[PDB]
C-alpha cells in the first residue's frame, strides 16, 4: 500500500526505509536493547508525565508570576495562567532544557518566594533531568547486559550438558572427546529430527 | 566490579571452608554439617586464639602437639594446617 | 577438656554420654573457654587440639574494629590472594590481630524522650476515644435506638470508624506538637 | 436484636474486607479522573479565582460528584483495611510477643530497651485476659507459667500475666456460676476488654499502612477545600502497581548512596565556593546594567547559593555563567577552576548517580 | 564483556588443568595437588 501511495506522492517511499528493522539481524540486536524493556520505558515516560504534572500544579498555585515569556514589555505572555498551558510548557520546555524548568522562567532573585522557587528548580532538575533520564539509560544498558547474559547462558548450557539426556560433560569426558562424541554421534538432535 | 568482588567473597565463604577448602556439599550430609564444621572444627578465630595461646604459653610447658605446632610455626612451615582433609574425612569409617 | 576429648573420640558410648549429662553444667560453663582446632599431626594423621581461650581475648576479638579488620583481610585474601600463600597471609593477619588485641587490652585500664512522648500521646488519645465510646449516655442512646433500622445501623457503623479516624488525627497532631516542644 | 445487629454488621465487615482492593483501584481511577478535569482550570481576575474553562459546561458538577465519591471511597478503603489487614497485623504482633515471652522472658528476665516503641507498648496486652485473640496458641500464659513460675515466683508471674490466683481452684471445687444475659448493655460493656482494645488501637495507629490510608483520607478531605489537593493522590501510583515499583526500586535500592553523593557534591561545591570567594570575586558580576553591579560572590552564602543553583545545572559548569577570564592575571588559575569544576561536578558526580541507578538495575 | 572474558579465563585456568581438563577438586585431595599437577606434571611450558 505504501509503495502504491508512493506514486501519488513520492515521499511515501520514505516509509519503506522502516524495513531496515526487519531486513538485518545486526540492527535487530541494537533495537532489542530498546524493545527488551519497552514496557518499563513506557511506564517511565508516564511516571515522568505524572511528576511534571505535580510540578505544574505547584507552579500554577504558587509561581504564576515567573512564567512571563514575552520580551515585548507591553503585552505579557503568561504560560501558566492556564493549567493545560502550564503543563504543556513544562513538558515541552523544561524536560528538554539542560538545567530543567529553571532555565526558561524568570529569575527568582529578590522575591519572597526565592528559597521555595530555588528548591522547586533544583528538585525539578534532580528528579526529571537527572534521575528519570538516567532510568531510561539504565533500562537500555540493562537490556544490553541481559541479552548478553542470556546468550552466554545458552552457550554454557549447550557446552556443559547434553540437550537430550541432560547428563553433564564431566561424565562423558572420562573418555577423550567423549562429550563431543556423545553429542554428535549418540544423542544428536539433528539425528532425532 | 566492586559488587562482583563482594558477592564472590560471600559465595566462597558460604561454599567452602576457609582452612581446609572442602566444599559444603561434603559436610552437609549431616544436617547443619557445614556450619558445625566452620564454627566448631575449623574456626579461623579458634586458630588465631591457638596462635595467641602458643605465643603466651611458656616454651618449657608445651605438650607434644603444642611443641610440634610451635616448632613448625618457628620455621614458618604451614603443613600442620589441614589442607583438603579433616577429622570427618579421616574417620569416615568409624564416625559413620 | 578431658571429657570433651573422650566424647569426641568416642561418639557412640552410652556410659560416657551418661557422664556427659552428669557433667553438663561444668561443660556449659567452660564452653566459651574451650577452644578446638584440627591439625595435621606428627603421625601423618589429623588430630584434635583443645586449649584455653581467655575472656579478654574473646572480648578483644569481638570488638567491632577487629571484626572490620577480619572482614577486610578475608576480602583481600579471597579476591587478590592465591592459594599457595593463603596460610602465610592468614598467619600474618593473626599475628597483627593478636598484637592489636593485646595492646587494646593493655590500654583498657581501670530517642527516649520521643518514645515517651509518643506513648503518652497514644495513651491520652486512646483513653479519650474510650471515654467517648463508654459513657453513661450510651445507655440513653441505646434506649433511643431500641428500634433498629438498616440505615441507623449503617450510620452508627460508619460513625465508629469516623471517630477512630478522628482519634488518629488527634494522636498525630499531638505527636507533632510534642516533637516540636522537645526539639525546641 | 443485638444478634441481628451483629449479623448485619458482620455482613458489612466481610463485604468491605472482600472489596478492599477493588476500591483502592476505584479511588485511584477517580483520582485520575479528577486530575484530568483539573487540567481544565484557569486563573481569572484583589482575589483571583480558579475557574473551569468548560466548553460543554458539564464538568463542574462532574468534578463535585467525583470529589464526593473519592472522599467516600477513601473512607470505605480505611474501613476495608481495618477489616482485612488489621487482623493479620494483630496476629503477627501477638505471635511475636508470645514467642518473646515464652522463649526469651522479655518481661520476666529481660526488659524492653526503653527506646523500643513496640516493646514498651506491648506491656499492656500481657495483663489482658483476651491476650491471644488472634494468635492460635491459647496456652501461652500457662507455658510461661510453667517455665518461669517455680524459679521466678509463681505469684509475681501470675500478676504479670494477669492470671487469677484462686478463681481456678474455687471454680474447680465448686463453680457456683450463673449465666449472664447478652441484652444487658452494662454486661456487654463489662464483657468487652478495654485494655486490649487500647493496645490494639495503639498498634493500629502505629501501623504504617493505616497511617498512609489516613493521610490519603485527609488529602481527600482537603481536596474539597482546594481541589488541587487531589493531585497528591496521584502519588498512589508508586503503590498501586508493581511494574512502577520495579522502576522505582532502581532509585530506592541505592538511595542512601544517592543521598550521600548529593551531600558530597554539596561539600565539593562549597570548597569551590570558598576558592571563588577568596580569589575570583570580580568575575561574579551578573548585572547587564553597567551602572549597578550584581555581585553574587560578595557574600559566602550568596556565592554558595549561586554555585549550587546555577553552576551545577549549567552544561559546562560554573564557567558558563561567570565573566570570561581572557586577559586576566588569574587566567590560568581560573581556567583550571572552571575545567576542574566541569570534570568533577558535571561529569563525575552525575556519572556516579547514573552508575548507582544502573547498578541497582543490575 | 571484556571484564567477564578476563575473569572467565582466570576461572578456567584456576579450576581445571589446561592439558587434561581434570578439575582441581580431584587433584586437591592431596594438599597443593592442583598446583603440583599444573606445575610439575602437566606444565604447558614443559610441553613446549
Ligand atoms: N543433543 C545435542 N545435539 C547436538 N549438539 C549438542 C547436543 N547437546 C549438546 N550439544 C552441543 O551443542 C553444540 C552445537 O552447537 P550449534 O548448535 O551451534 O552447532 P555447531 O555444530 O557448532 O554449528 P552451527 O553453529 O553451524 O549450527 C556443541 O558444542 C555440542 O556439543
Ligand atoms: N574457617 C572458617 N571459619 C569461620 N567461618 C568460616 C570458615 N570457613 C567458612 N566460613 C563461613 O564464613 C561465614 C562467616 O561470616 P563472617 O566472617 O561475616 O562472620 P559471622 O559469624 O557471620 O559474623 P560477623 O559478620 O559479625 O563477622 C559463615 O557462613 C561460615 O560458614
Ligand atoms: N597445564 C597448565 N600449565 C600451567 N599452568 C596451568 C595449567 N593448567 C592450569 N594452570 C594454572 O594456570 C595458572 C598459571 O597462570 P599464568 O599463566 O598467569 O602464570 P604464572 O605462573 O601465574 O605467572 P605469569 O603471570 O608471570 O605468567 C596457575 O594457577 C596454574 O595452576
Ligand atoms: Zn545425551
Ligand atoms: Zn575445614
Ligand atoms: Zn592435567
From Swiss-Prot, chain A:
Processing and modification events after translation: Channel activity is modulated by phosphorylation. Phosphorylation is increased in failing heart, leading to calcium leaks and increased cytoplasmic Ca(2+) levels.
Segments passing through the bilayer: 4-24, 43-63, 124-144
Per UniProt, subcellular location reads as:
Sarcoplasmic reticulum membrane
Per its record, what triggers expression of this gene product? By TGFB1.
User: In the UniProt annotation, what is the result of changing residue 153 to H?
Assistant: Decreased function in release of sequestered calcium ion into cytosol by sarcoplasmic reticulum. Changed ryanodine-sensitive calcium-release channel activity
Q: Which residues lie within the membrane without crossing it?
A: 94-103
Q: In which tissues is it expressed?
A: Detected in heart muscle (at protein level). Heart muscle, brain (cerebellum and hippocampus) and placenta.
General function of this protein? Cytosolic calcium-activated calcium channel that mediates the release of Ca(2+) from the sarcoplasmic reticulum into the cytosol and thereby plays a key role in triggering cardiac muscle contraction. Aberrant channel activation can lead to cardiac arrhythmia. In cardiac myocytes, calcium release is triggered by increased Ca(2+) cytosolic levels due to activation of the L-type calcium channel CACNA1C. The calcium channel activity is modulated by formation of heterotetramers with RYR3. Required for cellular calcium ion homeostasis. Required for embryonic heart development.
Q: What is this protein called?
A: Ryanodine receptor 2
User: What species is given as this protein's source?
Assistant: Homo sapiens (Human)
Region of the whole protein represented:
4727 to 4919 of 4967
UniProtKB/Swiss-Prot annotation, chain B:
Which segments does the topology annotation call Cytoplasmic? 1-96
What mutagenesis or variant effect is reported for residue 8 to H?
Answer: Decreased function in release of sequestered calcium ion into cytosol by sarcoplasmic reticulum. Changed ryanodine-sensitive calcium-release channel activity
The organism sits in which domain of life? Eukaryota
Which tissues express it?
Detected in heart muscle (at protein level). Heart muscle, brain (cerebellum and hippocampus) and placenta.
Indicate where this protein resides in the cell.
Answer: Sarcoplasmic reticulum membrane
Q: What upregulates or represses it?
A: By TGFB1.
The UniProt-reported impact of residue 67 to F is:
In VACRDS; decreased function in release of sequestered calcium ion into cytosol by sarcoplasmic reticulum; changed ryanodine-sensitive calcium-release channel activity; mutant channels are less respositive to activation by caffeine and store calcium overload; affects channel sensitivity to cytosolic and luminal calcium activation
> How would you describe the post-translational modification of this protein?
Channel activity is modulated by phosphorylation. Phosphorylation is increased in failing heart, leading to calcium leaks and increased cytoplasmic Ca(2+) levels.
User: Which disorder is it connected to?
Assistant: Ventricular tachycardia, catecholaminergic polymorphic, 1, with or without atrial dysfunction and/or dilated cardiomyopathy: An arrhythmogenic disorder characterized by stress-induced, bidirectional ventricular tachycardia that may degenerate into cardiac arrest and cause sudden death. Patients present with recurrent syncope, seizures, or sudden death after physical activity or emotional stress. CPVT1 inheritance is autosomal dominant.
Domain remark in the UniProt entry: The calcium release channel activity resides in the C-terminal region while the remaining part of the protein resides in the cytoplasm.
Family of the protein in this entry: Belongs to the ryanodine receptor (TC 1.A.3.1) family. RYR2 subfamily.
Record's protein name: Ryanodine receptor 2
Q: Which organism is it from?
A: Homo sapiens
Section of the entire sequence shown: 4872 to 4967 of 4967
Curated annotation (Swiss-Prot), chain D:
Please describe what this protein does: Cytosolic calcium-activated calcium channel that mediates the release of Ca(2+) from the sarcoplasmic reticulum into the cytosol and thereby plays a key role in triggering cardiac muscle contraction. Aberrant channel activation can lead to cardiac arrhythmia. In cardiac myocytes, calcium release is triggered by increased Ca(2+) cytosolic levels due to activation of the L-type calcium channel CACNA1C. The calcium channel activity is modulated by formation of heterotetramers with RYR3. Required for cellular calcium ion homeostasis. Required for embryonic heart development.
| Domain of life according to the entry | Eukaryota
The subunit field of the Swiss-Prot or TrEMBL record says: Homotetramer. Can also form heterotetramers with RYR1 and RYR3. Interacts with FKBP1A and FKBP1B; these interactions may stabilize the channel in its closed state and prevent Ca(2+) leaks. Interacts with CALM and S100A1; these interactions regulate channel activity. Identified in a complex composed of RYR2, FKBP1B, PKA catalytic subunit, PRKAR2A, AKAP6, and the protein phosphatases PP2A and PP1. Interacts directly with FKBP1B, PKA, PP1 and PP2A. Interacts with SELENON. In cardiac muscles, identified in a complex, composed of FSD2, CMYA5 and RYR2.
Intramembrane region spans per record: 311-320
Q: Show the stretches that span the lipid bilayer.
A: 25-45, 71-91, 221-241, 260-280, 341-361
Compartments, record wording = Sarcoplasmic reticulum membrane
UniProt source species: Homo sapiens
Name of this protein: Ryanodine receptor 2
Protein family membership: Belongs to the ryanodine receptor (TC 1.A.3.1) family. RYR2 subfamily.
